[PDB]
Ligand binder design. Sequence first.
Ligand code: CLA
Ligand code: CLA
Ligand code: CLA
Ligand code: CLA
Ligand code: PL9
Ligand code: LHG
Ligand code: BCR
Ligand code: OEX
Ligand code: FE2
Lengths: 52, 35, 153, 51, 52, 38, 42, 42, 51, 30, 245, 334, 93
Amino acid sequence: TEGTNEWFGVDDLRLLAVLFLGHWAILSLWLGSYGDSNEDEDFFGEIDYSAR
Amino acid sequence: MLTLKILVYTTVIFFVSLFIFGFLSSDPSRNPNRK
Amino acid sequence: DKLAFYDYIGNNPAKGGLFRAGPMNKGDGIAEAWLGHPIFRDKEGRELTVRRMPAFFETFPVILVDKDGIIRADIPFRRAESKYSIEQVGVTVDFYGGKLNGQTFKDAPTVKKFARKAQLGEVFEFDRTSLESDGVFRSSPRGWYTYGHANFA
Amino acid sequence: LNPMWRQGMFVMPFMTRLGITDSWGGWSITGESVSNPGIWSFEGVALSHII
Amino acid sequence: PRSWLCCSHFFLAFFFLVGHWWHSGRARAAAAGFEKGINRANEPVLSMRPID
Amino acid sequence: MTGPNPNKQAVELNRTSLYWGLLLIFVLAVLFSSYFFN
Amino acid sequence: EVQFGAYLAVLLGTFLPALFLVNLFIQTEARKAGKAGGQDSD
Amino acid sequence: EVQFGAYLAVLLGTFLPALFLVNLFIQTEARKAGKAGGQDSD
Amino acid sequence: GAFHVTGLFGPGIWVSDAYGITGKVQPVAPAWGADGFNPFNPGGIAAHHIA
Amino acid sequence: MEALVYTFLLIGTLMVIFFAVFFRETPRIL
Amino acid sequence: KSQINELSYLQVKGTGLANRCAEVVGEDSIKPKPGAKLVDMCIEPKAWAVEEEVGKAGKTEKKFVNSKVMTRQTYTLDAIEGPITVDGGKITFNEKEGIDYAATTVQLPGGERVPFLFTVKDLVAKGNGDTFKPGFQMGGDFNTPSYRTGLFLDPKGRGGTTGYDMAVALPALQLGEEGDAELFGENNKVFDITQGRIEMEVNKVNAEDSEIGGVFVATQLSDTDMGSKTPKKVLTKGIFYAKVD
Amino acid sequence: VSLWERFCAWITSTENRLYIGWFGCLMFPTLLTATSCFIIAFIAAPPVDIDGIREPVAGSLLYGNNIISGAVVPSSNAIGMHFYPIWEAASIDEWLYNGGPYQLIVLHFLLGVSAYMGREWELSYRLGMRPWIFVAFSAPVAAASAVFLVYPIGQGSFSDGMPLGISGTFNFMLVFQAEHNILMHPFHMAGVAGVFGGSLFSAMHGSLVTSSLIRETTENESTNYGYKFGQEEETYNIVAAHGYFGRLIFQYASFNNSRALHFFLALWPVVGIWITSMGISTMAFNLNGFNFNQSVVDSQGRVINTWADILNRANLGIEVMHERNAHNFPLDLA
Amino acid sequence: VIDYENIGYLGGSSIVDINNANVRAYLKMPGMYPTVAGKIVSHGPYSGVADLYKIPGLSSAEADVIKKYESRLTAKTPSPDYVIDRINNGLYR
Ligand code: CLA
Ligand code: CLA
Ligand code: CLA
Ligand code: CLA
Ligand SMILES: CC(C)=CCC/C(C)=C/CC/C(C)=C/CC/C(C)=C/CC/C(C)=C/CC/C(C)=C/CC/C(C)=C/CC/C(C)=C/CC/C(C)=C/CC1=CC(=O)C(C)=C(C)C1=O
Ligand SMILES: CCCCCCCCCCCCCCCC(=O)OC[C@H](COP(=O)(O)OC[C@@H](O)CO)OC(=O)CCCCCCCCCCCCCCC
Ligand SMILES: CC1=C(/C=C/C(C)=C/C=C/C(C)=C/C=C/C=C(C)/C=C/C=C(C)/C=C/C2=C(C)CCCC2(C)C)C(C)(C)CCC1
Ligand code: OEX
Ligand SMILES: [Fe+2]
């Protein structure tokens, strides 16, 4: 079944758990440094050199 | 054939997520000017 | 036999190729005898000459032309709407000289076989099993000498 | 009447000695047809000794 | 009129993709300071590792 | 990389041992050709 | 009828090992001309 | 059917000129190791 | 000898009959006695690499 | 038998591409 | 079915449903009328087998190895019409129109690709008794046309009803008294008609809906490319479905 | 300190042998899969139904080809524009028959080349360079996406896409001539001027530098060893090469500015290939080149032939012969 | 076929074949294309010009234009590759 109008080509239910665990497994890596930072600290630059 | 297919969506959104969260990783600040 | 042997398109140096190699006898084999000079006549009786292949054309359609240039017969590519086929016109072949000296073939299977080999100049019997002759024309030493010493210069 | 030892196969009787009969073409040395040999066929072993 | 629209808005839509490449190469480098060229006093390649 | 190897040596072959090794190959080429062409 | 893989056996059995032994002689004479320091070392 | 003199054309057209260019590099490095005077000149 | 040959975790050895008609890859159980040193016994090969 | 030569020319060409990238004569200032 | 007819076109397409014959429900008897005409006979094979030389333990008797179809979903016949004539002893069927050929290609062990035209052209079915029953079983011969119509051009440009008739880039072959008669077989393109024998078997009937359906088995001969090779015997099996009206 | 920051520091390090970057996260997996499938499909791949008429066209080396004739065949006419991966093929044998690996190679190629292009940007950012080498590389990316992607879209099938080979290229160029008349189209005209001009100004600039080199070597050693790497002295008299070309044509046609000179070398080809790759694109949607057939007539009205009528009879020969079995109806709409 | 007899009776000899000619061959006869020529080409093998009157669904006007050209119509041996492409053989002006 090729020309089915299914979201992201997700034919079976098993392929979702592949997608969610791919974006989140790197998201959780990303939040280990850029997450848990101050969401209220600004700049009047064009580009921020805040921290790591 | 639905076992290979699972293996591809792992490999695609592994590297696509490294791409997406690469430029969200304060990527303009990685220059030889400062920091 | 020597004079008709020059009247043959396989002895033209402008028929060979570059990356095919060896003598011209690798082309179609060592010549044995002259099969003769076929003369084509229709059921009306007029003389038809086969239009000859130029040196440019690797492939050329077999066309039979009378004395004034009118297309009288051919071998058709598209056999459906055929208006000048050999079956309609009824072309008979007559040999003169050579080893087919007095012979006449009248049916369309045999006349088509001699109409194809008559656009290649004269008609010869070759021996293609001695040198494993594949079936494509080579060039004379006139052609090779002109190749080197003009790409050198 | 034409086994692998008539066709001069040298290393091929060493693959079939330890348990490789199928190939990706679908043929087999035992003659029984196969739908899928998986990874370890004759082509899979040859390509893995290259890698 | 389909072949005029599919060959002219398609024609432009590549050059505006080139406009994304020009104007963002300059804007990312104008934010960083080196859009005018390399400094002769401070070249960044000379303060790196051996080349290999 | 790491440092330069102290086990670097040089290879030598004088003019004498050239003609031995050339003649060794051509005579083995003369001998074994007739069998290879069969 | 001869085997057409024998031309490749002989003419590479000549040339490939014989061109090898030439190379060990040329670099031998280059090292001797290398140390000698006159007109050829460079 | 291919021409059996083409194996000799290609495999000597590879090896004979390519083994030539190796020799000019080996004697180049031997002259550089020849002048340098350390552990490899001899 | 314990896994590839005996077919615990493997295909086994190509065995055959006495006259080369039938032959197939199958697991081979080891022969531990003096019959293991009969070299035409495929069980001696399994008993060797295990022992 | 004929295609064996073509394959050897292709992977032999990809060898000298490999050695030219990784074993290149690294240029040095001074 | 009527369940297939419930759907619209956009729900069927891309799903591989239009390839599949219907499933008839239940079993009873139905009687063919005097003017009875068969309406929607579809035939779809579910397995293929090519007769080969099989590698048994010591023997090489001819057996059928199966094969995987490689043309994707284009194998089913459809819309086959025809009147059902009533002979006294046995009910008969002769097909008239409809899509009664479906070209397809299967692959053997070894990598050999065997195309074959799967067809039911000029079918003369004959089955025991008069009324269609779950024990009913009809079959008969059909004529296979050639896989290529005579104006097909091979890679050199030679066909049966068009094209050249000599090796067009080998101009020195037609030299001598013999000409190119050594390669004569590859110049003469012969349109070939062979025979095939299908055997159908009704086992499930609706009489309130006048639609039958059961299992068949068909054997025929593969193609030869107008005398280029020896054709091979092809067996196939599947299910059919028909509307008896 | 974190694991991600120690990974971003490595993947954006210029101290690697080859810079990987964030585009290399999807350049390297894409182009190694386009490569490793190409080498297998070029060497060992069974024949492919390209015309959709179940006449399989051989394209690999094991099925009797060479470097010139062997080619990765485009996908079937039966598939056309449909996405055909391995898992939507029910076997690999059904995949390789219908033109499987043409879509796997091309789609991993165009992602990897559009990521190789962004990778040339990224390293220019991390090295302090002005950024626009990747804009010059947009010109072959425009042309690669024109014959593999855009032309199969507007013609509605990957079977009209370009065959990955050498003889398959000239099957592509000639059939494109008969159906679209590219030579009369002014965008192939504007890129023949781009590469004839490009190879002119290449060999014209490369000669005037090599002409005006300064004496730094002897006549025994090589000319090239008068350049020490990383030196700050200029290695050629640019006033000398300006006075030469200032007399070879005339004075005012010569760039004394070496920056404006080295910009014109980047302008002329790249603009010539942007324009050309939007010639294939506008001819993908059947907006063909010029057609001057039967344009010159006498006062009686009889057609007087021109060179375009002789060019037309060459186009009619390829049109009536391309895909000699695939057609059934009098007009090649595809 | 290399050497096929009755090439002339197909389209161009102005004496047409029945069971092998294209429907374009009956265009040269005024009155028969497309209706009367459509029935001749559609049905199966004929053995003579008398079998042209055996066509199911003939009028007196459809038999009239056959009666005119019955000297020009003639029937030959059906070679089965020409009998398929009788409606359309891929020839277009
Ligand atoms: C001016 C030079 C010249 C000319 C015109 C000829 C002409 C001829 N020679 Mg001859 N020959 C020559 C020099 C020449 N020879 C030399 C110098 C040698 C010694 C090696 C020979 C050895 C020789 C032999 C052994 C034979 C001939 C034969 C022949 C005849 C047919 C050759 C043929 O088909 O070409 C074949 C066509 C080509 C080879 C292509 C030409 C070269 C192309 C353009 C490639 C150019 C090289 C390329 C750029 C480099 C690629 C390198 C790469 C592989 C790494 C013909 C009359 C044959 C014959 O019939 O004799 C009885 C034969 O048996 N010759
Ligand atoms: C459960 C017990 C057990 C069993 C059943 C076996 C079973 C076997 N062993 Mg094994 N083995 C075992 C335990 C066991 N092993 C243990 C615990 C060890 C100690 C690690 C060994 C060490 C061992 C060795 C070292 C050898 C065997 C061999 C064998 C095979 C004997 C039959 C045969 O073909 O030999 C044939 C018998 C011989 C080849 C005799 C060897 C004598 C040599 C060849 C004399 C010549 C030497 C000279 C240099 C040759 C040049 C001279 C020339 C002029 C002739 C058989 C598979 C033999 C084997 O693998 O061969 C297939 C073998 O060589 N075994
Ligand atoms: C990482 C790089 C990469 C990329 C980009 C691709 C890309 C592709 N591969 Mg490939 N492949 C790769 C690596 C990669 N491959 C590797 C390493 C291997 C070896 C194992 C393979 C082996 C392979 C095979 C064997 C095949 C493919 C195939 C494909 C194609 C379809 C696969 C698919 O369904 O994607 C999955 C994609 C998605 C689910 C989409 C992800 C996109 C995300 C969601 C971004 C979108 C953002 C979103 C719009 C934001 C919305 C916001 C909201 C608020 C609106 C596609 C071109 C197939 C093909 O080309 O067949 C023709 C095929 O058969 N690949
Ligand atoms: C004097 C004759 C002449 C000349 C000079 C040209 C010139 C040109 N023609 Mg043209 N043409 C001519 C006659 C001519 N034509 C005739 C007579 C015909 C009719 C048969 C045509 C039909 C024709 C067609 C049909 C097309 C052209 C195209 C082109 C352009 C080709 C440039 C190109 O594709 O590079 C651009 C570069 C690429 C496409 C390559 C991209 C490669 C990517 C970036 C990377 C690949 C990397 C590789 C895989 C690995 C690298 C090495 C590795 C080891 C690392 C150029 C303007 C093409 C065109 O219009 O542009 C698309 C085209 O499609 N011509
Ligand atoms: C009295 C009588 C008897 C009566 C008869 C009358 C009579 C006498 C008639 C005769 C008159 C007659 C015809 C004479 C006219 C003479 C004449 C002009 C004839 C020639 C005919 C002709 C068609 C000429 C036109 C062709 C012509 C020469 C065109 C020039 C083309 C042109 C302008 C090119 C410029 C291209 C260009 C911008 C190049 C620069 C870019 C480039 C990379 C260059 C490299 C480079 C440049 C540098 O700059 C420097 C610095 C460096 C480093 C460097 O790399
Ligand atoms: C797959 C890759 C293929 C690899 C192949 C490449 C290697 C092939 C060549 C290597 C072997 C080279 C042998 C060099 C030979 C060599 O250089 O000799 C010199 C060498 C030792 O010489 P010295 O120790 O004096 O060396 C001093 C050094 O400065 C140089 O070696 O002698 C030997 O090793 C033993 C003598 C063999 C000499 C040959 C004696 C037999 C004479 C010939 C008989 C033929 C005539 C018979 C008449 C009937
Ligand atoms: C295989 C082949 C072939 C053949 C070829 C040949 C036969 C070749 C040969 C060649 C040759 C055979 C060459 C040679 C050359 C040489 C040279 C180049 C030399 C040089 C010399 C010198 C160096 C000298 C020195 C000296 C001395 C010794 C003394 C004094 C001093 C001097 C210096 C003078 C052909 C193509 C046919 C075909 C195909 C294949
Ligand atoms: O597929 Mn490839 O080429 Ca484009 O035109 Mn239509 O389609 Mn087919 O014909 Mn012509
Ligand atoms: Fe420059």
